[PDB]
Write a protein that binds this ligand. Structure first.
Ligand SMILES: Nc1ncnc2c1ncn2[C@@H]1O[C@H](COP(=O)(O)OP(=O)(O)OP(=O)(O)O)[C@@H](O)[C@H]1O
Ligand SMILES: Nc1ncnc2c1ncn2[C@@H]1O[C@H](COP(=O)(O)OP(=O)(O)OP(=O)(O)O)[C@@H](O)[C@H]1O
Ligand SMILES: [Mg+2]
Ligand SMILES: [Mg+2]
Lengths: 57, 89, 473, 506, 51
């Protein structure tokens, strides 16, 4: 999924050789990498959102 | 032997009312009760912030919308601007 | 109780041996007493020799000491007055007011020798104290809860740097300050006393925010080695009982180890390296560990060290390096180059210079400044013999930028304006980092290098260049 | 809290029981006390190096056993001791508690819990002076210790049981590499495979308590304290305690080593160990040696360091890796203790301020920094499969060997110049950012097939970061395959080359 | 709310330290010092009689 999302992004960079000066498609790809990179970090740092009534309480 | 028993007894007279019981404290002039369990009970939240992060303020996330759902006045302009770029492309 | 009394057997320079009686042996580091015609001579006990004999250290001169004189035991370590009343009163190694402003009316008296505050230690290494001096703010920020280096040889300007700090920090700060002044010239102490009087920091009929301790080189070695602890005791009383931010100041910590070496030879111990005391690291650590941030309170201590014969590898400076976070070497070569302050930017160094604390932009600016200055030192040998024309174009650009930078690190002081003729100036951190980054980018390379000397911000450099091109050229 | 009250009551009752069961008569009498030294008349049958108790409550170790009176050093201050005090004998040689409850705690040289988190659960009690393993009960170093530093991994390998010295100057980064290794071990310290676990044990001899407070705050922030033990000997403590602490920590690590586990010891600033021993020997009127140091400082360091070893399969194939630190004055490695320690260790890691101010953050002098073990104790992925990771040492020697004296002659010289300077800019790393072998391999592999085409020097850092991103995304198969198998197969070499050239074209 | 409890643990021991001052000041004002020598006498008898 994550590798599949940008797999087609390596298709547009090949498509970008004939189309030079793309204002926002790369930015949209940049945006879809900026938020997605924020996704993996968010879930990996995400502890189980709970207070351990057994131990931590 | 007694010299340990009596100091063990001494631990049951001077600090018995200190924490073992709640008979305040005889040697001290300042009281023991209105410091820790009432003034310093809120002490941990007197060190951190109150009514905002101890209550924790479980706040609804601010909702962000799409591009105002107004495509016609921008998609064609983008399409017109796409013509401008592809002439320069 | 009965007064513990004994007989003096040996008086060896500053070392006195006392023979006592049945089970009358005093404690180590405990004040004794000799009724001298001049006054009171206390005999701090250093070691026990057995046979009811103890080896002691005299805090005053041992003139007129006859063997067999009556001695008296105080019963504890040297006791000094402590409290807010000490503010504005100049005291001594023993605690008597030497300001002749009447007797001291202290409420508490505390022992001189204490212990380090265990692991009740906080670590708040995030408070960059705004000093005003351009060089220190960039490459070695001073922490508000740390210990400050100030190294350097004779006549390198360490005391002037201390006066600049006391001018810029003490005035605009909420919290008491203590100046111990170990083994400096009495002239310097007198000037410092006067200046705090006129400035208003201490008022003879006011509040006063400084407790003045003083031990000069006129004191014998024992007093010069104990006065630092006496001032530290005042600092500790103000940090604990009052719960204030104290600002301990000394003039020279090297004199403490020097006096320790003085007393060590006659104390009867095998000499250590280059004739120092064997108990150098231990005693110096005992002295400099009591000075600490101390969870209930906080302290900043601007240390000051004298390097013997401009040797940075001398055992005392080498040992005191490890107990300091922010350091300042004040190399002499910079002094004969005319750049005052004479601090060496390549050896200043501090822990707070990290991107998380000082900021990413500041870290990058400091790193690039270090590179520009270090390229000059690397190419010095080639430049000295052959010349700059034998260098590459990039080498020429780097060396001229380095010259401009190292000339721009200079800053006038409000204390040493008599030695410069230029009024003192202060530069904020945000201003100096921006100016240095602007110079690094190459925005100012047509400006003559002389325009960076005795200036503040980059705007001052621009103005100086304008004048230089106007009338000078 | 009434519970500590009865705990103290039963403490006092066994205190009485222990105290009134001695009836000793050889209990000596203090003749004289010096600066932390006390000669005592008595203890006729005292053992050497044996612990004692003074009537005040201060401990002492029996160094000198000359006839008549005995030389006792003081674990603490001579504050409370006088002449004519009865000196209690322990009956045993100085000992330190050992066990698995040490993890997550901070103790002193003796081993008392000093962090203030309660008592210590000790599985045993070992000597401070134990004999190093013999010639046979050991095995050569083969398993590599992953430092997380590319310059310390691909260039100067270290492994289980070796002795790598961080030689260098003051505030050059000596503690940085050690703490980075401690943080890097978290990757495998969180698993289940005990053969890959590396518990960390660290000594702090002479460093001020504020520094160790910042350090322990550091390990707990990155969640490394759970597998680390800190023994502290600040300059405030007496010289005997500082002199003893590294030996106690060596025993602590040897517990894991003999129990089949793997552990890492950092002998931080072993020089102040030497100066504390100097103070000890001089205060004992022992004849000094060269430059006032005691003669047997070489033996002191040898006995301490050689205890670290890689055991053989017969005893359990445990390991103990020594990581000592020595600070030199003005880069003078010809100094006595620096020479002894460079001759005692299994290699060294030189750090100098000049490269530090040149921009190189690790400041590793690859010219002098050498390891006595090369191919052994190195992950194979950073080895012959990568090819040049057998011989970057020669390449970095030659690039330094033609800087201006070996001025560029032809295109080969220019190519080597660009390659070397790009690599030196590539080896840079930042503190508190340990890395892993599976992403070491791609970066340096790119250093052989396309590195001069890097996007100018100031932007090769985000080049390496973006290369790591382009290999962690859409190319996780390469990273995995090279991280479990640990080497690069022929098809794996082809895939890695293809990926490197694909991002080169990018 | 944990280190406050931990600080509650540490502070509680601290007034127990000054409690010992109250305890020890109670220890010095007794005729037990006369009675305590008999405690050694019976104890030292039990000590060497064991041997
Ligand atoms: N900022 C400055 N501007 C001008 N002159 C300065 C400055 N700082 C120091 N000096 C000069 O340096 C010289 C020595 O000054 P100072 O008394 O501070 O020396 P020092 O290093 O503290 O001395 P010592 O080793 O005797 O304690 C004086 O001639 C003084 O004018
Ligand atoms: N990779 C790095 N990136 C950034 N800063 C670093 C790096 N390595 C070291 N430093 C900095 O270098 C300085 C010294 O590093 P470190 O804490 O390892 O000290 P050290 O060399 O062990 O010296 P000491 O003997 O004085 O403790 C510190 O200011 C630290 O932040
Ligand atoms: Mg001076
Ligand atoms: Mg370090």
């Amino acid at each position: 999924a994550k590798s599949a999302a940008n797999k087609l992004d390596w298709a547009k960079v090949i498509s970008s050789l004939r189309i030079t000066g793309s204002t926002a498609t790369q930015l949209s790809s940049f945006k879809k990498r900026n938020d997605e990179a924020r996704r993996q970090l968010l879930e990996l740092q995400s502890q189980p959102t709970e207070v351990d009534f057994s131990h931590y309480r | 032997q007694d010299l340990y028993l009596r100091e063990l007894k001494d631990t049951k007279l001077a600090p018995s009312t200190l924490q073992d019981a709640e008979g305040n404290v005889k040697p001290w002039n300042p009281p023991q009760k209105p410091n820790l369990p009432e003034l310093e009970l809120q002490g941990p939240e007197a060190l951190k912030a109150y009514t905002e992060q101890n209550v924790e303020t479980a706040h609804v996330a601010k909702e962000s919308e799409e591009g105002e759902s107004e495509p016609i006045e921008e998609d064609w302009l983008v399409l017109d601007d796409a013509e401008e770029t592809k002439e320069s492309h | 109780s009965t007064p513990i009394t004994g007989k003096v057997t040996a008086v060896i320079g500053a070392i006195v041996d006392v023979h006592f009686e049945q089970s009358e042996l005093p404690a180590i580091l405990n004040a004794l007493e000799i009724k001298t015609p001049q006054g009171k001579l206390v005999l701090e006990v250093a070691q026990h020799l057995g046979e009811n004999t103890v080896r002691t250290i005299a805090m005053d001169g041992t003139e007129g000491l006859v063997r067999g004189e009556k001695v008296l035991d105080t019963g504890g370590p040297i006791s000094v007055p402590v409290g807010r009343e000490t503010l504005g009163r100049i005291i001594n190694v023993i605690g008597e007011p030497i300001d002749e402003r009447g007797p001291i009316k202290s409420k508490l008296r505390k022992p001189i020798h204490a212990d380090p505050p265990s692991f009740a230690e906080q670590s708040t290494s995030a408070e960059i104290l705004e000093t005003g001096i351009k060089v220190v703010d960039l490459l070695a920020p001073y922490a508000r809860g740390g210990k400050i280096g100030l190294f350097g040889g004779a006549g390198v300007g360490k005391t002037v740097f201390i006066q600049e700090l006391i001018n810029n920090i003490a005035k605009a700060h909420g919290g008491f300050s203590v100046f111990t002044g170990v083994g400096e010239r009495t002239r310097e102490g007198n000037d410092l006393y006067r200046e705090m009087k006129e400035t208003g920091v201490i008022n003879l009929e006011g509040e006063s925010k400084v407790a003045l301790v003083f031990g000069q080189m006129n004191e014998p070695p024992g007093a010069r080695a104990r006065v630092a602890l006496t001032g530290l005791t005042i600092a500790e009383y103000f940090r604990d009982e009052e719960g204030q931010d104290v600002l301990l100041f000394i003039d020279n910590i090297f004199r403490f180890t020097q006096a320790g070496s003085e007393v060590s030879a006659l104390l009867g111990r095998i000499p250590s390296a280059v004739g120092y005391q064997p108990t150098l690291a231990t005693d110096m650590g005992l002295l400099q560990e009591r000075i600490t941030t101390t969870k209930k309170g906080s302290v900043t201590s601007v240390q000051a060290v004298y390097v013997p014969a401009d040797d940075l590898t001398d055992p005392a400076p080498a040992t005191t390096f490890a107990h300091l976070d922010a350091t300042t070497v004040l190399s002499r070569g910079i002094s004969e180059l005319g750049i005052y302050p004479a601090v060496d930017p390549l050896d200043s160094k501090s822990r707070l210079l990290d991107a998380a604390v000082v900021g990413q932009e500041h870290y990058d600016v400091a790193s690039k400044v270090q590179e520009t200055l270090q390229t000059y030192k690397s190419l010095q040998d080639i430049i000295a013999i052959l010349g700059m024309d034998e260098l590459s174009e990039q080498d020429k650009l780097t060396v001229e930028r380095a010259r401009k930078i190292q000339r721009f690190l200079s800053q006038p002081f409000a204390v040493a304006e008599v030695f410069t003729g230029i009024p003192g100036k202060l530069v904020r951190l945000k201003d100096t980092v921006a100016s240095f980054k602007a110079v690094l980018e190459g925005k100012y390379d047509n400006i003559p290098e002389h325009a960076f000397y005795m200036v503040g911000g980059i705007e001052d450099v621009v103005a100086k260049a304008e004048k230089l091109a106007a009338e000078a050229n | 809290k009434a519970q500590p009250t009865e705990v103290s009551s039963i403490l006092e009752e066994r205190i009485k029981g222990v105290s009134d069961e001695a009836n000793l008569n050889e209990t000596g009498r203090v003749l004289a006390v010096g600066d932390g030294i006390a000669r005592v008349f008595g203890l006729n049958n005292i053992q050497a190096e044996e612990l004692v108790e003074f009537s005040s409550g201060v401990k002492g170790m029996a160094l000198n056993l000359e006839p008549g009176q005995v030389g006792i050093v003081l674990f603490g201050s001579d504050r409370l001791v006088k002449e004519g005090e009865l000196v209690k004998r322990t009956g045993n040689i100085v000992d330190v508690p050992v066990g698995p409850g040490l993890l997550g705690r901070v103790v002193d040289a003796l081993g008392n819990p000093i962090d203030g988190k309660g008592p210590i659960d000790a599985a045993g009690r070992s000597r401070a002076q134990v004999k190093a393993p013999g010639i046979l009960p050991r095995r050569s170093v083969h398993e590599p210790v992953q430092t997380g530093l590319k310059a310390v991994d691909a260039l100067v390998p270290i492994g289980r049981g070796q002795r790598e010295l961080i030689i260098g100057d003051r505030q050059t980064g000596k503690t940085a590499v050690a703490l980075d290794t401690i943080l890097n071990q978290k990757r495998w310290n969180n698993g289940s495979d005990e053969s890959k676990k590396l518990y960390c044990v660290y000594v702090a001899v002479g460093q001020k308590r504020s520094t160790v407070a910042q350090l322990v705050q550091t390990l707990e922030q990155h969640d490394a304290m759970k597998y680390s033990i800190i023994v502290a000997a600040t300059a405030s403590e007496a010289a005997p305690l500082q002199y003893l602490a590294p030996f106690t920590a060596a025993s602590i690590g040897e517990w894991f080593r003999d129990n089949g586990k793997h552990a890492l010891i950092v002998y931080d600033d072993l020089s102040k160990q030497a100066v504390a021993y100097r103070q000890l020997s001089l205060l004992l009127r022992r004849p000094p040696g060269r430059e006032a140091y005691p003669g047997d400082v070489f033996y002191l360091h040898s006995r301490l360091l050689e205890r670290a070893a890689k055991l053989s399969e017969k005893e359990g194939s445990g390991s103990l890796t020594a990581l000592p630190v020595i600070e030199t004055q003005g880069g003078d490695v010809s100094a006595y203790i620096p020479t002894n320690v460079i001759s005692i260790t299994d290699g060294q890691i030189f750090l100098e301020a000049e490269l530090f101010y040149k921009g190189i953050r690790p400041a590793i002098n690859v010219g002098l920094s050498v390891s006595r073990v090369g191919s052994a104790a190195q992950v194979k992925a950073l080895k012959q499969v990568a090819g040049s990771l057998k011989l970057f040492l020669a390449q970095y020697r030659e690039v330094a060997a033609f800087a201006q004296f070996g001025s560029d002659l032809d295109a080969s010289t220019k190519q080597t110049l660009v390659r070397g300077e790009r690599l030196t800019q590539l080896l840079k790393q930042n503190q508190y950012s340990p890395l892993a072998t599976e992403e070491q391999v791609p970066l340096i592999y790119a250093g052989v097939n396309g590195h001069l085409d890097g996007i100018e020097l100031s932007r090769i850092g985000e080049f390496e970061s973006s290369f790591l991103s382009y290999l962690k995304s859409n190319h996780n198969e390469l990273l995995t395959e090279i991280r479990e198998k640990g080497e690069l197969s022929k098809e794996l070499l082809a895939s890695l080359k293809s990926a490197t050239e694909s991002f080169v074209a990018t | 709310w944990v280190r406050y409890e931990a600080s509650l643990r540490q502070l509680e021991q601290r007034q127990l330290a000054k409690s010992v001052i109250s305890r020890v000041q109670s220890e010095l004002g007794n005729p037990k010092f006369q009675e305590k020598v008999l405690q050694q006498s019976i104890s030292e008898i039990e000590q060497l009689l064991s041997k």
